Design an enzyme around this catalytic site. Structure first.
Site, PDB file in Angstrom:
ATOM      1  N   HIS A 177       0.816  -1.214   0.000  1.00 49.84           N
ATOM      2  CA  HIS A 177       0.000   0.000   0.000  1.00 49.84           C
ATOM      3  C   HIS A 177       0.851   1.266   0.000  1.00 49.84           C
ATOM      4  O   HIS A 177       1.847   1.375   0.726  1.00 49.84           O
ATOM      5  CB  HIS A 177      -0.908   0.017   1.232  1.00 49.84           C
ATOM      6  CG  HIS A 177      -0.153   0.050   2.524  1.00 49.84           C
ATOM      7  ND1 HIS A 177       0.094   1.219   3.208  1.00 49.84           N
ATOM      8  CD2 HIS A 177       0.424  -0.939   3.248  1.00 49.84           C
ATOM      9  CE1 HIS A 177       0.778   0.949   4.307  1.00 49.84           C
ATOM     10  NE2 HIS A 177       0.998  -0.354   4.352  1.00 49.84           N
ATOM     11  N   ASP A 178       0.414   2.241  -0.795  1.00 53.39           N
ATOM     12  CA  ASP A 178       0.915   3.613  -0.818  1.00 53.39           C
ATOM     13  C   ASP A 178       2.344   3.723  -1.313  1.00 53.39           C
ATOM     14  O   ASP A 178       2.965   4.788  -1.153  1.00 53.39           O
ATOM     15  CB  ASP A 178       0.799   4.272   0.558  1.00 53.39           C
ATOM     16  CG  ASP A 178      -0.621   4.203   1.105  1.00 53.39           C
ATOM     17  OD1 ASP A 178      -1.563   4.635   0.401  1.00 53.39           O
ATOM     18  OD2 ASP A 178      -0.809   3.680   2.219  1.00 53.39           O
ATOM     19  N   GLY A 186       5.014  -0.631   3.359  1.00 50.18           N
ATOM     20  CA  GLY A 186       4.130   0.445   2.933  1.00 50.18           C
ATOM     21  C   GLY A 186       4.863   1.766   2.748  1.00 50.18           C
ATOM     22  O   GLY A 186       5.874   2.044   3.392  1.00 50.18           O
TER      23      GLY A 186
HETATM   24  C1  U20 Z   1      15.771  -4.613   7.375  1.00 50.11           C
HETATM   25  C2  U20 Z   1      14.470  -4.121   6.750  1.00 50.11           C
HETATM   26  C3  U20 Z   1      13.430  -5.254   6.685  1.00 50.11           C
HETATM   27  C4  U20 Z   1      12.113  -4.745   6.078  1.00 50.11           C
HETATM   28  C5  U20 Z   1      11.038  -5.834   5.963  1.00 50.11           C
HETATM   29  C6  U20 Z   1       9.767  -5.299   5.295  1.00 50.11           C
HETATM   30  C7  U20 Z   1       8.695  -6.380   5.093  1.00 50.11           C
HETATM   31  C8  U20 Z   1       7.427  -5.764   4.485  1.00 50.11           C
HETATM   32  C9  U20 Z   1       6.338  -6.772   4.098  1.00 50.11           C
HETATM   33  C10 U20 Z   1       5.154  -6.078   3.399  1.00 50.11           C
HETATM   34  C11 U20 Z   1       4.218  -5.454   4.435  1.00 50.11           C
HETATM   35  C12 U20 Z   1       3.273  -4.448   3.766  1.00 50.11           C
HETATM   36  O1  U20 Z   1       2.412  -5.060   2.790  1.00 50.11           O
HETATM   37  C13 U20 Z   1       2.332  -3.844   4.785  1.00 50.11           C
HETATM   38  C14 U20 Z   1       2.976  -2.902   5.777  1.00 50.11           C
HETATM   39  O2  U20 Z   1       4.160  -2.568   5.788  1.00 50.11           O
HETATM   40  O3  U20 Z   1       2.053  -2.430   6.785  1.00 50.11           O
HETATM   41  C15 U20 Z   1       2.574  -1.550   7.771  1.00 50.11           C
HETATM   42  C16 U20 Z   1       2.418  -0.093   7.373  1.00 50.11           C
HETATM   43  O4  U20 Z   1       3.155   0.185   6.169  1.00 50.11           O
HETATM   44  C17 U20 Z   1       2.926   0.776   8.522  1.00 50.11           C
HETATM   45  C18 U20 Z   1       2.931   2.261   8.136  1.00 50.11           C
HETATM   46  O5  U20 Z   1       1.587   2.710   7.860  1.00 50.11           O
HETATM   47  O6  U20 Z   1       2.063   0.544   9.641  1.00 50.11           O
HETATM   48  C19 U20 Z   1       2.081  -0.807  10.115  1.00 50.11           C
HETATM   49  O7  U20 Z   1       3.391  -1.114  10.578  1.00 50.11           O
HETATM   50  P1  U20 Z   1       3.847  -0.595  12.034  1.00 50.11           P
HETATM   51  O8  U20 Z   1       4.983  -1.465  12.507  1.00 50.11           O
HETATM   52  O9  U20 Z   1       4.042   0.891  11.936  1.00 50.11           O
HETATM   53  O10 U20 Z   1       2.497  -0.968  12.797  1.00 50.11           O
HETATM   54  P2  U20 Z   1       2.051  -0.868  14.339  1.00 50.11           P
HETATM   55  O11 U20 Z   1       2.657   0.341  14.999  1.00 50.11           O
HETATM   56  O12 U20 Z   1       0.568  -1.107  14.334  1.00 50.11           O
HETATM   57  O13 U20 Z   1       2.683  -2.214  14.944  1.00 50.11           O
HETATM   58  C20 U20 Z   1       2.284  -3.483  14.415  1.00 50.11           C
HETATM   59  C21 U20 Z   1       2.451  -4.569  15.475  1.00 50.11           C
HETATM   60  O14 U20 Z   1       3.776  -4.529  16.018  1.00 50.11           O
HETATM   61  C22 U20 Z   1       3.717  -4.521  17.450  1.00 50.11           C
HETATM   62  N1  U20 Z   1       4.859  -3.773  17.974  1.00 50.11           N
HETATM   63  C23 U20 Z   1       5.106  -2.519  17.551  1.00 50.11           C
HETATM   64  C24 U20 Z   1       6.213  -1.832  18.043  1.00 50.11           C
HETATM   65  C25 U20 Z   1       7.055  -2.464  18.965  1.00 50.11           C
HETATM   66  O15 U20 Z   1       8.054  -1.846  19.410  1.00 50.11           O
HETATM   67  N2  U20 Z   1       6.797  -3.724  19.378  1.00 50.11           N
HETATM   68  C26 U20 Z   1       5.728  -4.396  18.905  1.00 50.11           C
HETATM   69  O16 U20 Z   1       5.483  -5.569  19.281  1.00 50.11           O
HETATM   70  C27 U20 Z   1       2.381  -3.881  17.777  1.00 50.11           C
HETATM   71  O17 U20 Z   1       1.881  -4.369  19.024  1.00 50.11           O
HETATM   72  C28 U20 Z   1       1.498  -4.337  16.632  1.00 50.11           C
HETATM   73  O18 U20 Z   1       0.868  -5.582  16.958  1.00 50.11           O
HETATM   74  C29 U20 Z   1       1.724  -1.792   9.002  1.00 50.11           C
HETATM   75  N3  U20 Z   1       1.905  -3.165   9.446  1.00 50.11           N
HETATM   76  C30 U20 Z   1       0.901  -3.794  10.059  1.00 50.11           C
HETATM   77  C31 U20 Z   1       1.141  -5.210  10.516  1.00 50.11           C
HETATM   78  O19 U20 Z   1      -0.176  -3.245  10.229  1.00 50.11           O
END
Ligand code: U20
Ligand code: U20
Ligand code: U20
Ligand code: O5P
Ligand code: O5P
Ligand code: O5P
EC number: 2.3.1.129
Lengths: 263, 263, 263
Positions: free
Chosen positions: C125-126, C143
């Site tokens: 997305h985006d 994203g």
């Molecule tokens: C060495 C580099 C490796 C990179 C690997 C990349 C792999 C990418 C695979 C494709 C994914 C893509 O299609 C979608 C995507 O990236 O979505 C996210 C969206 O781009 C983002 C911004 O808008 O927001 C989300 O990511 P965030 O990590 O910012 O989400 P969040 O803050 O809701 O945290 C998600 C989960 O992590 C948990 N969390 C967060 C922080 C932390 O310190 N500990 C923890 O457990 C938290 O409880 C929650 O259950 C989004 N995710 C989710 C699961 O909703």
């Protein structure tokens, strides 16, 4: 039996004996074998293969090109009638594979509820995934792996057979996990090593300040005190007498078979 | 022609000119092009695309969402009628891709017999995979790569174009191979480096104690003696005069074009 | 409307309201939703899912098991009618996923023209992918990622959310990008770090000797001078007064939100 309120697309092939629940939806070009049970409200979008002795709960969303219940990739497997169990409200994305168990490994691959399995995540034979987990794209579990409640595994990361990913763990992307990860820990690297407590996750999930402090102190006992694991186990049990969240470590230690990830 | 004992599912599309052998099985929603030959007893489970000038042997098992014979990803390819050859008794898992050759690279992508190609393994144009190999999930070969007999490549590992993965090699998971891997070697890392002889594999495959010792001594000549490769080549040939297994090194050296992986 | 010169295979399901251009080809077992527009000459080989509010240009080639326009994997997404835009002459290979935007992220996932998206590349997305890009097998964008014109991302490489991959960048395989990559740079590793200017790419793309020298000098200002980025920005702008190619750095700096990759 197919519930009268389930939708089965005319191009889907549901074999006689499959059980399809109320208001389920089987999209075009899906294949559903005769020992499959699909729960109420579950959706197979299109082009989904579900076979084997496989029970799927309610309100799941399973996207195209997923393979659920399929013969596993263990060369030891010989066609025995092993099983898959999947709970409720999972989001199982394109090309995810979830494979049936092996007799040698207990006969069962299990996934709980409210999980998000992203594109091409792989759940091998005899794995146990808990509730509220996230596997990012291409996250790959070898056979017999446990992913405990709320654990998150980043993109491209693979986990060696029999390892335990503890509750509320966060494994970074592009990592390779070769040993067991205690609950509440952040892990990253190739091979993965520990980087402290997943404080932000615990915060968002309602853990108290006192519980997080105790968990941080248990982490320090394991990785900063310099004592052996055998010395710290009773110290962690002692801490758990006051802070019940710390008991997760004790329960994990009893299941751990590969040793802990370490610096 | 379609053998009278082959099964072709009513939803499959087998184009006129395809050759389908006795007791083969073409599952639902498969597509088979007019220049495809599928050998006796081979099974396409469902949702398999096979096209191009592609010959597949007997008793293969090809799982859903695999693409066999497809146009390769080399920008130099321009639609020329290149080829794929696949042997017997392979297990080719979900989402595996095996692409046709390029004129520039010799015109042929080849896979032998008794291989296990796990989910989303990729066999690029002009690759040569031998017999009894294993590619784990997401193992990715660039164009022109050789994977010699019995070699195993771990999950998430990628191999740079033209590299040779020697016979009986074991490449760890989460690795990136940028140079040639001599036969009998364990390799791991990003980029991959050598970690001694694959003793356990040779043991299980019937190599004698004397042959493994000689192979270990050849490994030491290459990586521990401190001499140049040009100095050790005749020393390895001399050793092969007594232990024929050591000749695999000589044969490999003659094919190697990228240099050897090194510490 | 379906143009009278488009081909729609009898097994494909094109929902009323879909727009299919002249001489397009919708292969067997494809699904095309009612808000999809497919441009003149575009081919969906077979087993392709296209849905959502999704506009696809002309002369594209989209291979089997691709999912274009699908619901994204951001837990914040709630079904809002967001969009995908794809330009012309793209080669979108097996199992590629391109997901719709989120309201929070601007509502749009965009891909330009003349790109090559290899097997199982993921456009979240985006994201914004420019023109003439290459994503190798399993390259994975989180994203909100930007991949600017001519940038190439190697096999197995993943990019953290919001990062910018600058114009004419080359990211190695088996890498993890956690910060922004300036235009013209080679990057590699886990996490990725800079390895100089992509001189060979600029050469092949018609950049003059003077422009490449100026780009190399801008690279030195950023990474070798030892000054802060705030000090070098006006020095790079000054250099751009003579060599307009250097302006790409200025434009990139204004978009960069995660800091630059560094040694
Ligand atoms: C060495 C580099 C490796 C990179 C690997 C990349 C792999 C990418 C695979 C494709 C994914 C893509 O299609 C979608 C995507 O990236 O979505 C996210 C969206 O781009 C983002 C911004 O808008 O927001 C989300 O990511 P965030 O990590 O910012 O989400 P969040 O803050 O809701 O945290 C998600 C989960 O992590 C948990 N969390 C967060 C922080 C932390 O310190 N500990 C923890 O457990 C938290 O409880 C929650 O259950 C989004 N995710 C989710 C699961 O909703
Ligand atoms: C940095 C971490 C990277 C992790 C990457 C993980 C990627 C996982 C991809 C998903 C795979 C999953 O779906 C299936 C799985 O894990 O199956 C195995 C099963 O969980 C296991 C236990 O029950 O048993 C098997 O693995 P083992 O490695 O224990 O099997 P084995 O002892 O039969 O050895 C397999 C092959 O390796 C060869 N070998 C073994 C040891 C050695 O030192 N050298 C060697 O060549 C040996 O000759 C044989 O051909 C099983 N495999 C096979 C091929 O049968
Ligand atoms: C740590 C190891 C990680 C390994 C990861 C491997 C991932 C492999 C995924 C499977 C790919 C496989 O199916 C196809 C394949 O490997 O094809 C190529 C073909 O095997 C090769 C030889 O015949 O030729 C091609 O690769 P090259 O890199 O040699 O091609 P090229 O010289 O045309 O360069 C391709 C692009 O890179 C740009 N480039 C090249 C060099 C440079 O220094 N900078 C640069 O930008 C150049 O402008 C061009 O746009 C082919 N590619 C392309 C895109 O045509
Ligand atoms: C600097 C760094 C180091 C290692 N890994 C990363 C990394 C992993 C991911 C990732 O897979 N996802 C899934 C898509 O939701 C966004 C994100 C959530 C997540 C974050 C961290 C661990 C596991 C999941 N994103 N960045 C970053
Ligand atoms: C500590 C360590 C370091 C590097 N790689 C690994 C690693 C690779 C794998 C893996 O891909 N598979 C395939 C599924 O069969 C199980 C296993 C067989 C195998 C083992 C070793 C190399 C290649 C294949 N498992 N662990 C472990
Ligand atoms: C020593 C080394 C280090 C890091 N990465 C590699 C590496 C990446 C690839 C790769 O993905 N492809 C795609 C298929 O076209 C061939 C090649 C083009 C390419 C080259 C370099 C970067 C990005 C793309 N091949 N080798 C090698």
């Amino acid at each position: 039996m197919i519930d009268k309120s389930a939708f089965v697309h005319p191009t889907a092939i549901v074999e006689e004996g499959a059980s399809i629940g109320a208001n389920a939806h089987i999209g075009p070009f899906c294949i559903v074998g005769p020992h499959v049970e699909i729960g109420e409200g579950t959706v197979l979008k299109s082009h989904v293969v579900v076979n084997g002795h496989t029970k799927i709960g309610r309100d799941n969303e399973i996207y195209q090109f997923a393979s659920i219940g399929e013969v596993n990739q263990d060369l030891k497997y010989a066609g025995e009638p092993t099983r898959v169990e999947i709970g409720d409200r999972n989001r199982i994305r394109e090309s995810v594979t979830i494979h049936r168990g092996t007799v040698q490994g207990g006969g069962l691959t299990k996934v709980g509820s409210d999980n998000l399995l992203m594109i091409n995540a792989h759940i091998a034979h005899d794995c146990t995934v808990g509730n509220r987990c996230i596997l990012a794209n291409n996250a790959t579990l070898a056979g017999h792996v446990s992913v405990d409640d709320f654990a998150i595994i980043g993109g491209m990361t693979a986990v060696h057979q029999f390892c335990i990913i503890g509750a509320h763990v966060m494994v970074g992307g592009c990592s390779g996990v070769a040993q067991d990860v205690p609950p509440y820990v952040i892990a990253q690297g190739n091979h993965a090593t520990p980087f402290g407590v997943n404080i932000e996750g615990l915060k968002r999930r309602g853990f108290s300040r006192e519980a997080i402090t105790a968990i941080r102190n248990a982490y320090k006992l394991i990785y900063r005190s310099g004592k052996t694991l055998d010395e710290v186990k009773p110290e962690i049990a002692e801490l758990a007498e006051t802070y019940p969240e710390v008991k997760a470590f004790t329960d994990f230690f009893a299941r751990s078979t590969r040793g802990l990830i370490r610096h």
